[PDB]
Amino acid sequence: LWPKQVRESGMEGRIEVTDAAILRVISEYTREAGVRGLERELGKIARKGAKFWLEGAWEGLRTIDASDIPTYLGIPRYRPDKAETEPQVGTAQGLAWTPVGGTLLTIEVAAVPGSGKLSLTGQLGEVMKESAQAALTYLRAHTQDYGLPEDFYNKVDLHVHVPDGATPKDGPSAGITMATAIASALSRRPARMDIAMTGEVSLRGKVMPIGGVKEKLLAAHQAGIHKIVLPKDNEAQLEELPKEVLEGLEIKLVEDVGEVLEYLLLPEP
């Protein structure tokens, strides 16, 4: 890519770029599943380099590191690493595969004392509501181990917001995502950032496996999440993926929804 862009603008043997600068362009100036964005970003770097060179060729070979990138681009539109934002109360970084590139569905659920029912916002589907119901049903089996009062279902309304309008995968794939979202919201403790998750939740509290583990392992690299949670029933689904996809990940193969919540719920009560 870069040897094409620096040849678009006639930078033959004039501009060099290190690994850190390309990584800055990747993780700080474009977020999409493909590499179309990096083409135009490196093109803009080439054009700015041609501009700065045309007003004086002082340097024989200009090294562009991860420091002078903004001079050609400006402000990082996205966080460098997603491990720097905050832990939030009602936030669960989901995983999905939107046909326009993978992205994390920040499903947000708010618990308000009141009648006791499920408020269903954000264009849920049938399966999305059933997943919320399944998460509540499991959380009802074990409540005193999460600090909740045993009468929470009788008196707490839950406002659930799922982005991307309807379900993006055209099917439930964020079971444990909603499980941890609702557990944090009901317990009102900061859920963990920096860890995306996906799965299926079953009322006995079992993590049924997902389809297409490759997409749920990519759409967390593109989103910048470097610790993913997967169902244990997909352990053999990690024996055909290329080694590049598995690079940088601390994958927690899980089977219960009592061990997905070991990670995110560091504050239980």
């Binding site: 006639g10 803009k44 041609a50 501009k51 060179w53 045309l54």
Partner: protein, 288 residues
């Protein structure tokens, strides 16, 4: 009676074209025949102009094939060569000229400087596109004309512009082969006739509203003219010979982010033109 009166009206309109008739009597088939030797022209273009002369020897208000052939000859002999607008290879001079459009806009001037620094730094290190011409995007009330005029002033190009926005027929964009009237040399050919320097600036106005009732998409001609490896061989329905357009610079303006064909997304890119504010309008008013 009404039909005969309208027939006599159109025939009298044909008769009262004395100015066209005078050109046909002396300039056409005689001065044009010598015009080949008087001016420098490519050998193949000269010989095809010789056939175009052979397409003459009949009245130009009779068979429309002869009329459109004479239009081809008039748009041929009045396009000289071996001349070009001088370059200013300094982005600083271009910025100096940009300083007085309104003030430079402080943003778009820099994007145009990107485009110019790439323009001077190419595979041949010359004016060859191999890249977009970066249509302008913004509200219609902004100084869209001022950017192109200032760049032409700085870069020393004889600025042009042609009507491509809001049209509905393809004779102001492409034209159609010289076998019937109503098919005319395209406005790009007219602009190339406007001046002989082979590096003009053919501003394309309101490209976002380009359309036509003539089915057969002009966007193919956009791809043809926007590709420098294909703009030298830029043909249309009308252009029966690949007309050598090598050093011709280009630029375009638009005012909407939606009405644009997708074959106009590669070899084409966005420049956003911010609107002016009451303080910006105050300053530009008071000063200019």
């Amino acid at each position: 009676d009404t039909n005969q009166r309208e027939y006599y009206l159109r025939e009298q309109m044909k008769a009262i074209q004395k100015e066209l008739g005078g050109e046909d009597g002396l300039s056409d088939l005689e001065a044009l025949r010598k015009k080949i030797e008087e001016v420098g022209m490519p050998e193949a273009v000269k010989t095809k102009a010789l056939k175009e002369l052979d397409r003459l020897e009949r009245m130009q208000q009779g068979s429309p094939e002869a009329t459109v052939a004479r239009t081809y000859l008039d748009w041929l002999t009045e396009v000289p060569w071996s001349k070009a607008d001088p370059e200013v290879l300094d982005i600083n001079h271009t910025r100096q000229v940009l300083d007085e459009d309104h003030y430079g806009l402080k943003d778009v001037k820099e994007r145009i400087l990107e485009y110019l620094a790439v323009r001077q730094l190419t595979q041949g290190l010359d004016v060859r596109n191999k890249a977009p011409i970066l249509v302008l995007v913004g509200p219609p009330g902004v100084g869209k004309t001022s950017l192109g005029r200032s760049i032409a002033r700085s870069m020393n190009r004889k600025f042009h512009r042609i009507s491509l926005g809001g049209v509905r027929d393809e004779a102001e964009i492409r034209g159609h082969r010289r076998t019937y009237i109503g098919a005319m040399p395209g406005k790009l050919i007219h602009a190339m006739k406007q001046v002989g320097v082979i590096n003009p600036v053919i501003l394309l106005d309101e490209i976002d509203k380009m359309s036509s009732d003539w089915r057969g998409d002009p966007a193919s001609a956009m791809l043809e003219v926007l590709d420098p490896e294909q703009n030298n061989t830029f043909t249309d329905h009308y252009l029966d010979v690949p007309y050598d357009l090598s050093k011709v610079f280009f630029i375009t303006t638009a005012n909407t982010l939606q009405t644009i064909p997708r074959p106009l997304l590669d070899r084409m890119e966005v420049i956003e033109i911010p609107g002016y504010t009451n303080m910006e309008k105050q300053a530009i008013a008071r000063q200019y």
